[PDB]
Amino acid sequence: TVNVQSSLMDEKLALQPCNVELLESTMINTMFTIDMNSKLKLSALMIPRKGENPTPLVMVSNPHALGFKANLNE
Amino acid sequence: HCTWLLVLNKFEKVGLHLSKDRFQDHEPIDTVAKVFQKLTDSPIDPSENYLSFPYYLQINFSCPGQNIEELARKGHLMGMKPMVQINYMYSVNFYRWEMENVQILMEAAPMRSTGYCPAEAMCVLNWYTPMPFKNGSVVSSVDIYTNGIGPFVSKKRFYVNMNGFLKRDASGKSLFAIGYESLVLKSSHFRLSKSRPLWYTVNHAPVFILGG
Amino acid sequence: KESTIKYMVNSFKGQMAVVTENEEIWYFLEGGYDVYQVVPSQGWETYHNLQKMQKSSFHSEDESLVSLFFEDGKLFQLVYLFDVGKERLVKRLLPVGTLMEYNLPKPFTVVNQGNYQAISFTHTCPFKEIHLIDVPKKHHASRTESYVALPPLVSESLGFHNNNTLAVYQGLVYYLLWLHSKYDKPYADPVHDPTWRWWQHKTKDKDYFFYLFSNRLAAEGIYINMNAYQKLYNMSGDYGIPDLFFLDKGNWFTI
Amino acid sequence: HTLCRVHTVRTGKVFKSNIQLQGDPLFYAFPNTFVLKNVCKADISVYLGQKVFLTIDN
Amino acid sequence: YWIQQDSLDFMSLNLVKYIDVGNTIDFQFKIIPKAMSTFPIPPVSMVVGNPGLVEVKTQGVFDLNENYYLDIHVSGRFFQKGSTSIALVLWEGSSKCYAITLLPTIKSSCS
Amino acid sequence: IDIPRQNITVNTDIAAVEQWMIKITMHEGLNIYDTEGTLLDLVREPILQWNLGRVLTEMEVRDLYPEVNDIKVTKSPCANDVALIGFMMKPSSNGVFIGKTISGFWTYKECIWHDLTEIIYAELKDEHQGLTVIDLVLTNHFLVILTSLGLYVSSDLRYPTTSQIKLSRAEFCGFERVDYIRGNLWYNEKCFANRESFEVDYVTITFNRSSSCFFSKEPFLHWLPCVFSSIPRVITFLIDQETDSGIYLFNVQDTKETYVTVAMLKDGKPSPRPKFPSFHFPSTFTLPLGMIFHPRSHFLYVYGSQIWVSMDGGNTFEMLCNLFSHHVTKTSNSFYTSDIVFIVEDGRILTTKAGLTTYSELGILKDAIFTLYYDQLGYIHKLTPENFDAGSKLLGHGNSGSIFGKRPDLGFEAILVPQYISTNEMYFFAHVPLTMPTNIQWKKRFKTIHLGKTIEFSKTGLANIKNVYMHKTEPVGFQTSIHTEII
Ligand SMILES: *[C@@H]1O[C@H](CO)[C@@H](O[C@@H]2O[C@H](CO)[C@@H](O[C@@H]3O[C@H](CO[C@@H]4O[C@H](CO)[C@@H](O)[C@H](O[C@@H]5O[C@H](CO)[C@@H](O)[C@H](O)[C@@H]5O)[C@@H]4O)[C@@H](O)[C@H](O[C@@H]4O[C@H](CO)[C@@H](O)[C@H](O)[C@@H]4O[C@@H]4O[C@H](CO)[C@@H](O)[C@H](O)[C@@H]4O)[C@@H]3O)[C@H](O)[C@H]2NC(C)=O)[C@H](O)[C@H]1NC(C)=O
Ligand SMILES: *[C@@H]1O[C@H](CO)[C@@H](O[C@@H]2O[C@H](CO)[C@@H](O[C@@H]3O[C@H](CO)[C@@H](O)[C@H](O)[C@@H]3O)[C@H](O)[C@H]2NC(C)=O)[C@H](O)[C@H]1NC(C)=O
Ligand SMILES: *[C@@H]1O[C@H](CO)[C@@H](O[C@@H]2O[C@H](CO)[C@@H](O[C@@H]3O[C@H](CO)[C@@H](O)[C@H](O)[C@@H]3O)[C@H](O)[C@H]2NC(C)=O)[C@H](O)[C@H]1NC(C)=O
Ligand SMILES: *[C@@H]1O[C@H](CO)[C@@H](O[C@@H]2O[C@H](CO)[C@@H](O)[C@H](O)[C@H]2NC(C)=O)[C@H](O)[C@H]1NC(C)=O
Ligand SMILES: *[C@@H]1O[C@H](CO)[C@@H](O)[C@H](O)[C@H]1NC(C)=O
């Protein structure tokens, strides 16, 4: 049983730490339905590393059928 | 850096003299009815009675390396106005008075001193505030701080306490009833004297006295 | 046991100062079982030298302690400076926190940095920082009644105040406190907040009055604002743990 | 030693049970081995290779 | 230092606001200090150009993390026109930050 | 994308209009990748409609290189990137040459050079060997050119009729080619985009040498003396529109007195009887040279051998820099990012930002003749004949440290001794060797420049300076010290 998280610390490899501290939401638990002339709101909470500046993005599998507007606020 | 300077003035000498006066009068005076009568286009009903507290708070501030008057002119020209917070301390006799404790938040009003003024506009400039007091207290603490504009001057706490040990004479000058104001401090008094306690009731003593 | 205490000064808020015959001040914090010598000490020498560098007017080479006392939790000592020509008695401040922060011999160790070694002082405080959150409203906790009386506006171009304007300010503040006193009558009155009975009908004319002031048509150029003189019940201002707390029959608080 | 540490799972052999294999075993046509996991139930999987193993357990 | 202004149309460094008679302009800024901070005193010092035609009320609050929130409320005195500039300066901040001073202009006039 | 212009501006009138900022983002709410730029309106800019003069072809501009003596720039207040460059030349060159740009000198090639000699000659009545332009200033609706032979004012930029710029000559008399060449023009840069009634443009002209100051209101056709009736010399007169006052910088010859006087601007004319008592600079203020307002602000700067800044309207000044036997020649600044650049004699460049008492030094430039320019986005440019240098390194915002290779060391050749005063604070005492010449003391002393600076140590070291103390006598052998926070 290889534990990749621990193996990604060999000094020869010399990886860089993850730049985001937290990225969480309750949206992962359930699937959602959009009926005709209906909309929904999704929420996520993200905390970056002390010094790093990660850029969050939101994507959709089917852009022809689904449109999104995303707002990131502190 | 900069420090506040607060002084008590009289009603009859608000701008003429900048020297300190002692908080000798504890009765409101009625020398204001005339100006309120003269005031028409204002929400003032002639029925209600209007009279004044004696004394004013004169406020200026000093920073090292610059004289006071150009500092006051500067503070005015930059938009800064003192804010004053007067807090009263209740009397010990809760049988006679009530334990209730009040505050009053005021803002100082700039006034040019009544001097010659070679300059066309501004001169010696001081911020004045009424000094209010109420029945049942003799200790009030005055916190002065800027309104956030202009130069920064640290919040300073003064005490304007009633002086009940004075008396008037024929000439009208405030002279002490307890003793004679006829001595000057000398270095010989403090050269050989050791430190001594200062005893008083902790929050309700207006006047401090030190002997020894 | 070599020293003898001349007298004791208390803060009534958790701190105490001790003056001996040798004129050395010791400090005691009621939390701990420790007395610290503050005035004859390395930190005081540092602070005194800094006051020399800053050219403070309260600090001199030769001085004599007249006495010391606590004012609202701050240690103020009145001292006679023996400056040549400008000798004077003045009340100075003793910042004991600053004196403790500058006491300098302290446990330190030589750490290692990039092929170089530097002096790292060993921290002694069990915590990095302490903070109070969810504090309780100071004015409600200490049961204080607060008023506001802002100065009347003036139409003068430079913004200065005459003696008559200050007289108007004086009378308005007096009348505010007069209503404060007359609010203690036994009968309820229809509307709380005593200043209501002062404004009453006039509250319907505000625009008119304001008009006459905006165009500088109003009497002596003074403007008396209704909202300027009133008793504030709820404000969000200075915070932290209030000093006094009042409790009545099972009511509680949290910190 | 480095990376993962080996351990072998072997149960039901505590006594000399002799059950012979019935039928002809299946074999994955391709030379490489593969493990196909049931997406919904993690425990169920199929090892495809020289011999085909369908495990309800992991 | 970092200056945060989350209100839209207030984000731009240069901005001009118009006040009519009796109208009022309110805005809020947040200052995050990336380092120690001069905590007893506010990190922002502000000055007004011709305070004779504008009255300014400023409220400042510190928090747990030493961030500084200030709210500025700007109103006109009486019926006259003119313009004044209120400058908010991070006196402590070094000369290397992209934005140290902010210079709103308040006009008493027809927008 | 294709945006109809009616979706942005929706009117087309020749008037002073502000240049827009552009931000390209991947997602406006979820701001992830963004780029900054500008947008300029070409049908409304006043100066762009007119034709400046005979355009100089290639191989003709470069013939001016051996003749150029100084460079001057106009900023075009409301919309930057519309600057004009003027060559000041030695009496050998018989012409007036001015170049114009549209992209803020980002590319040297895209600069159009014109010769306005014939337009001046049309209204010229005093011909001489030299007519090279001494100074030029661009107001919101007008252009004022102090040519060697006189002062000229553009007719009006809003209403174009002639299709070529028309310059009318403003008259003062007894001014020889000599008085005009020592003149210079002071103009408070403010943007009047919508031109409210109270907003007026004032321009003052001062010539060292019957007064030497003169000043004038909007159309600059009638110039009146800015001072009325052992004589103070008005170095600079400025109009404070916000407080409606006149500000004089006075220097008295034969003594060392220097003072700024503020007077109420009664009926459009500066009154006597100063508004409030005048501020007197120390006697150490050797030679003042100028006094300016930072654009679209109320900060007042006085420069020369020393640099002073005044909060409020010249009531009190705080000296932020002293220069010994050196003087500030030219000043440059931008309303955007509020950068201030002082170009001192010897080529050193001091930098600051408006309202800050502390300043820094960017570096030393050895170019013989040059000037510094700030465009709309705050990018700094070095302008020399045949070279417009934007910066060796580019950054996402307009930093002004792009031109110079690296930030300089503010240190000096002295001996420091460190002393702990707490766990976190520290002293550095700078030793001035006993027997050191008094004339050499300053070489080993901390200055005002070191406030708010960081101290670095080669082995391992980093700390921040929070206060600078001067104590000549208290320790023997040390004259200055810094109180420092350790990092
Ligand atoms: C920063 O950048 C922005 C970018 O847009 C810039 O905004 C622009 O500022 C201009 C100021 O110079 C504004 O001009 C004004 O335009 C008015 C028209 O308003 C109408 O608004 C409707 C809804 O908003 C809109 O549908 C309508 O659209 C079109 O209008 C056309 C007429 O121009 C018409 O042909 C079309 O069919 C359609 O209807 C308009 O947008 C003008 O009315 C207004 O006053 C007129 O000015 C013009 C020329 O100046 C003149 O011919 C006319 O007589 C009016 O002049 C007089 O005005 C004074 C008071 O101003 C009165 O006393 C007189 O009686 C007249 O009314 C003005 O010009 C422009 O609207 C605005 N654009 C946008 C999109 O908001 C900022 O100005 C820039 N800021 C800085 C500091 O630079
Ligand atoms: C700022 O406020 C301070 C105190 O509030 C003022 O200081 C006071 O100045 C007066 C000057 O009139 C001093 O009065 C004394 O008068 C007698 C009688 O002539 C004279 O003999 C004394 O030598 C002195 O002049 C007073 O002592 C002084 N008080 C203090 C505490 O310094 C100051 O004048 C105000 N400054 C401005 C510019 O308004
Ligand atoms: C503390 O309370 C006392 C009494 O409650 C206040 O004194 C009283 O003030 C009123 C108003 O000035 C006086 O009314 C006056 O009465 C006399 C005679 O009737 C008359 O000359 C006036 O026309 C007016 O009607 C009242 O006499 C006076 N009481 C006494 C005993 O002097 C006092 O002002 C309060 N102190 C403060 C600081 O508020
Ligand atoms: C404000 O000061 C003025 C003086 O400038 C005071 O007016 C004087 O009042 C006395 C009353 O005894 C008259 O004798 C003087 O002639 C008045 N002066 C002038 C110039 O007329 C006025 O009383 C003061 N204000 C208040 C509220 O007392
Ligand atoms: C241009 O403006 C019109 C409204 O006048 C709008 O319908 C159209 O979508 C706009 N064009 C773009 C590219 O947004």
UniProtKB/Swiss-Prot annotation, chain B:
Subcellular location as annotated: Cell projection, Cilium, Flagellum membrane
Disulphide bonds in the chain: C2-C63, C117-C123
Tissue specificity statement from the Swiss-Prot or TrEMBL entry: Testis-specific. Specifically expressed in the principal piece of the sperm tail (at protein level). Expressed in spermatocytes and spermatids within the seminiferous tubule but not in interstitial cells.
Domain of life: Eukaryota
Glycosylation sites: N60, N135
Function: Auxiliary component of the CatSper complex, a complex involved in sperm cell hyperactivation. Sperm cell hyperactivation is needed for sperm motility which is essential late in the preparation of sperm for fertilization.
Oligomeric form and interacting partners: Component of the CatSper complex or CatSpermasome composed of the core pore-forming members CATSPER1, CATSPER2, CATSPER3 and CATSPER4 as well as auxiliary members CATSPERB, CATSPERG2, CATSPERD, CATSPERE, CATSPERZ, C2CD6/CATSPERT, SLCO6C1, TMEM249, TMEM262 and EFCAB9. HSPA1 may be an additional auxiliary complex member. The core complex members CATSPER1, CATSPER2, CATSPER3 and CATSPER4 form a heterotetrameric channel.
Note: Catsperg2 is absent in sperm from mice lacking Catsper1, suggesting that stable expression requires Catsper1.
Family note: Belongs to the CATSPERG family.
Stated name of the protein: Cation channel sperm-associated auxiliary subunit gamma 2
Species of the source: Mus musculus
UniProtKB/Swiss-Prot annotation, chain D:
Compartment(s) where it occurs, according to its Swiss-Prot or TrEMBL record: Cell projection, Cilium, Flagellum membrane
Phenotypic effect of disruption: Mice are normal but males are sterile. Male sterility is due to defects in sperm cell hyperactivation and decreased stability of Catsper1.
Record's function text: Auxiliary component of the CatSper complex, a complex involved in sperm cell hyperactivation. Sperm cell hyperactivation is needed for sperm motility which is essential late in the preparation of sperm for fertilization. Required for CATSPER1 stability before intraflagellar transport and/or incorporation of the CatSper complex channel into the flagellar membrane.
Residues represented out of the complete protein: 17 to 74 of 805
Species in which this protein is naturally found: Mus musculus
Superkingdom assignment: Eukaryota
Gene: Catsperd
Protein name from the UniProt record: Cation channel sperm-associated auxiliary subunit delta
Subunit composition and interactions: Component of the CatSper complex or CatSpermasome composed of the core pore-forming members CATSPER1, CATSPER2, CATSPER3 and CATSPER4 as well as auxiliary members CATSPERB, CATSPERG2, CATSPERD, CATSPERE, CATSPERZ, C2CD6/CATSPERT, SLCO6C1, TMEM249, TMEM262 and EFCAB9. HSPA1 may be an additional auxiliary complex member. The core complex members CATSPER1, CATSPER2, CATSPER3 and CATSPER4 form a heterotetrameric channel.
Family recorded in the similarity comment: Belongs to the CATSPERD family.
Tissue: Testis-specific.
Curated annotation (Swiss-Prot), chain E:
Organism: Mus musculus
Tissue specificity field: Testis-specific. Specifically present in the principal piece of sperm tail (at protein level). Specifically expressed in the seminiferous tubules but not in the interstitial cells. Within the tubules, it is expressed in spermatocytes and spermatids, but not in spermatogonia.
Subcellular location: Cell projection, Cilium, Flagellum membrane
More info: CatSperb is absent in sperm from mice lacking CatSper1, suggesting that stable expression of CatSperb protein requires CatSper1.
Source species, domain of life: Eukaryota
Coiled coil: none
Gene that encodes the chain: Catsperb
Function per UniProt: Auxiliary component of the CatSper complex, a complex involved in sperm cell hyperactivation. Sperm cell hyperactivation is needed for sperm motility which is essential late in the preparation of sperm for fertilization.
Quaternary organization: Component of the CatSper complex or CatSpermasome composed of the core pore-forming members CATSPER1, CATSPER2, CATSPER3 and CATSPER4 as well as auxiliary members CATSPERB, CATSPERG2, CATSPERD, CATSPERE, CATSPERZ, C2CD6/CATSPERT, SLCO6C1, TMEM249, TMEM262 and EFCAB9. HSPA1 may be an additional auxiliary complex member. The core complex members CATSPER1, CATSPER2, CATSPER3 and CATSPER4 form a heterotetrameric channel.
Name the record gives this protein: Cation channel sperm-associated auxiliary subunit beta
